[PDB]
Amino acid sequence: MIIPALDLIGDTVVRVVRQRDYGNDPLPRLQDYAAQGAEVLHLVDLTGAKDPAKRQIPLIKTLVAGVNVPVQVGGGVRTEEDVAALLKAGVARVVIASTAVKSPDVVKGWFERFGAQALVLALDVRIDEHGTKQVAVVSLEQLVETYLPVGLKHVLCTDISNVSLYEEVCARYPQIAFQSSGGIGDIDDIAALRGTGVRGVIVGRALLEGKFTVKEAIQCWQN
Numbered sequence: 001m002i003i004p005a006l007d008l009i010g011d012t013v014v015r016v017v018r019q020r021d022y023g024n025d026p027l028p029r030l031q032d033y034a035a036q037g038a039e040v041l042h043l044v045d046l047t048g049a050k051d052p053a054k055r056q057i058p059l060i061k062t063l064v065a066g067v068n069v070p071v072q073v074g075g076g077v078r079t080e081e082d083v084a085a086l087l088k089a090g091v092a093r094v095v096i097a098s099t100a101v102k103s104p105d106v107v108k109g110w111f112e113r114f115g116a117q118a119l120v121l122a123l124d125v126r127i128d129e130h131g132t133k134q135v136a137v138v139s140l141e142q143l144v145e146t147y148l149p150v151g152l153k154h155v156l157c158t159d160i161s162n163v164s165l166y167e168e169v170c171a172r173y174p175q176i177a178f179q180s181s182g183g184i185g186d187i188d189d190i191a192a193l194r195g196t197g198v199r200g201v202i203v204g205r206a207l208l209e210g211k212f213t214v215k216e217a218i219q220c221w222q223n
């Protein structure tokens with residue numbers, strides 16, 4: 001799957017690493033992502049990620065209501081209440097950050113209550129000098145072990161160290177549906193990831209930049 005994605009600061013669509021400002025119409029943007037055939041969408045609430053007390057619930061309610069396809073939302077999700085709040089806003093899956101790295105027993109609890117189909121674990125992966133896949137702020141393997149007993153199913157992988165990693169880990173963990181994020185700059189990057197075993201590709205920047213349209217991405221990826 002192609003998974004189009006918007007990063008949000010307040011009501012404002014942005015490019016980040018803040019880099020560029022693209023307006024205050026996330027909804028027509030999303031709806032046009034959907035019109036072209038996107039099956040899943042992806043939001044990051046950077047305002048909430050900065051401080052969770054300012055979680056943009058009303059906004060996210062609106063955005064999720066305005067489209068008729070599942071939406072996954074991340075950004076500062078670090079307590080059970082936040083997960084419930086996001087779900088209560090209509091969100092189809094909650095994307096969890098570094099907490100799932102730091103606090104396995106808590107997060108295991110979230111899995112046990114909400115179920116694994118509702119959660120996505122977001123991991124920044126570093127390949128080090130030695131060739132170990134480590135997980136940013138512990139190895140990938142270690143994490144997968146920690147969460148297999150509670151039915152781990154969805155991982156969002158950003159590589160911050162490209163095809164071959166995904167080939168190997170997708171082969172090692174056939175029970176995990178991997179999502180690649182970052183590293184997309186043109187339609188060819190999408191073609192590249194096509195046969196790797198990766199299940200979903202997060203696409204953001206390239207779309208705002210007009211390199212291609214979601215219809216083109218889908219044409220590519222879906223061969």
Ligand code: NA
Pocket residue numbers: 001002037038039218221222
């Ligand atoms: Na697709």
